[PDB]
Amino acid sequence: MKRAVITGLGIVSSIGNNQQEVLASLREGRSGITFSQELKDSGMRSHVWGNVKLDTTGLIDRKVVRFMSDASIYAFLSMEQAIADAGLSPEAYQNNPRVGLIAGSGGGSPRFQVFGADAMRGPRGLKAVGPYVVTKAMASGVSACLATPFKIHGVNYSISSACATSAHCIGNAVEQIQLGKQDIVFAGGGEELCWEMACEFDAMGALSTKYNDTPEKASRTYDAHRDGFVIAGGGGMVVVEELEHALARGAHIYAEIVGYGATSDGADMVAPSGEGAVRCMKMAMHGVDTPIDYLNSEGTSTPVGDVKELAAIREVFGDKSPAISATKAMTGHSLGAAGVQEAIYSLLMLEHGFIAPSINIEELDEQAAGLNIVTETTDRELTTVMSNSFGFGGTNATLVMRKLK
């Protein structure tokens, strides 16, 4: 029913402005978290975040970047990398009805929305707002701002599902390939980092605040002393392609997506049920004859969420649990981008034969009884990896990637 593989990837995150710098952080277990004067100044309780250490000035043409917000900028630079890394040229993916793009952001653009309102409420009104805000503020800014400049002609929309946003874009891209509708679909997303949005999460008490003095130690998934997640920003993009088409062009193939799970909890608004995650991982694992060697969990670094996922994993596997690591302990939570960025970390691990360490665990949580929680970079021969993404609204996404035959 048509198979789907990844033929290229691109990424911009708190731990790397490309897959090279990223692979390096993953191996040394480098933290992307830094104290942020912006957050502390806004009056927040959280003073840390996984910021992108990149000066994007001049990296994008003036007539293009003028419609974009940081989530569009981070996803656009990621799409440039994935295109090159996929070995694709304009002639092959542009003005091609069979090449699409499905990417989005978890929160559109709080920053430009507040800028519009603030500017509008000033003496210059509409003239201060300017004619470029709609595209920066709209929820589909990440897919709109890339499909136009990259001249995409197939599918063009953004899936939004909070923290599982970019995992669903990929899953949806696969279904496009499976349905025989598209030969290639660029899938992923981005997310800006600003107080405007982070203050909403702190007001909800979901961001760690007891470690503003040891930033690199704030995100500490599965540690009995975790107190919430560290907000992060960035972008990511993967080239999802139909198998025959990619073998035909002699493309590099990182892996085949043999599993995609999308489920709903129908329970709580801001906390996972666990019952949903269980069914979600199982749906993804359905059909996959190879065991899951590694699992990049959601591991948000929150008291409730972490404990829930652990029980869920123990329910799906039990004793025969795969290696597990919460890359968020070092990268933070890029919210909408977390899905694609974590699918990439999973691919790099599968590609280079290793397992990133779950860092900052000065004391494991009782809820992680018989689970293989890797806490040190371990060289292993991976064949089948799994990534879990959970978001508010009890929305769940699970992806299973396996090395080709």
When CB distances are held under 5 to 8 angstroms depending on the partner's kind, the choice from a copy of itself, ligand [N+], none that residue 231 binds is none
Nearest CA-CA partner of 230 in 181, 302, 298: 302
Q: Which is nearer to ligand [N+], 113 or 140 (CB)?
A: 140
Nearest CA-CA partner of 375 in 354, 362, 359, 353: 359
CA atoms within 13 A on the CB side of 399: 36
CA distances from 286 to 32, 33, 54, 309, 319 (A): 35, 36, 40, 19, 19
CA distances from 42 to 53, 115, 121, 237 (A): 21, 15, 20, 31
- 119: which residues sit within 8 A by CB, 6+ positions away? 125, 128, 129, 130
Is residue 262 near a copy of itself by the rule CB under 8 A? Answer: yes
Nearest CA-CA partner of 64 in 55, 54, 53, 76: 76
**Residue 7 Cβ, how far from a copy of itself at the closest point, in Å?**
20
Is residue 396 near ligand [N+] by the rule CB under 6 A? Answer: no
Nearest CA-CA partner of 346 in 17, 18, 22, 127: 22
Six-digit token string for 322: 């795969």
Residues 153-172 vs a copy of itself: string with x where CB under 8 A?
A: xxxxxxxxxx-xx--x---x
Q: Which of residues 319-338 bind a copy of itself (CB under 8 A)?
A: 336
Give the interface size with a copy of itself as a residue count (CB under 8 A).
Answer: 92
Is residue 89 near a copy of itself by the rule CB under 8 A? Answer: no
* 99/125 Cα distance (integer angstroms): 41
Among 342, 349, 360, 391, binds ligand [N+] (CB under 6 A): 342
Cβ atoms of 10 and 237 closer than 8 Å:
yes
**Residue 236 Cβ, how far from a copy of itself at the closest point, in Å?**
17
Is residue 150 near a copy of itself by the rule CB under 8 A? Answer: yes
Is residue 195 near a copy of itself by the rule CB under 8 A? Answer: yes
**Residue 138 Cβ, how far from a copy of itself at the closest point, in Å?**
5
Q: Which of residues 277-316 bind ligand [N+] (CB under 6 A)?
A: 296-298
At 318, give phi and psi (nearest 5°): 90, -110
Q: Which is nearer to ligand [N+], 16 or 116 (CB)?
A: 16
When CB distances are held under 5 to 8 angstroms depending on the partner's kind, the choice from ligand [N+], a copy of itself, none that residue 270 binds is a copy of itself
Is residue 387 near ligand [N+] by the rule CB under 6 A? Answer: yes
**Residue 125 Cβ, how far from a copy of itself at the closest point, in Å?**
4
Q: Which of residues 116-145 bind a copy of itself (CB under 8 A)?
A: 116-118, 120-121, 125-127, 129-135, 137-141, 143-145
**Residue 128 Cβ, how far from ligand [N+] at the closest point, in Å?**
34
Cβ atoms of 299 and 222 closer than 8 Å:
yes
Is residue 36 near a copy of itself by the rule CB under 8 A? Answer: no
Cβ atoms of 381 and 352 closer than 8 Å:
no
**Residue 272 Cβ, how far from ligand [N+] at the closest point, in Å?**
13
Among 59, 89, 95, 248, binds a copy of itself (CB under 8 A): 95
Question: DSSP assignment of 18-78, as one string?
Answer: SHHHHHHHHHHT----EE-HHHHHHT-S--EEB------TTSS-HHHHTT--HHHHHHHHH
Q: Which of residues 211-240 bind a copy of itself (CB under 8 A)?
A: none
Residues in contact with ligand [N+] by CB under 6 A are 296-298, 342, 387-389
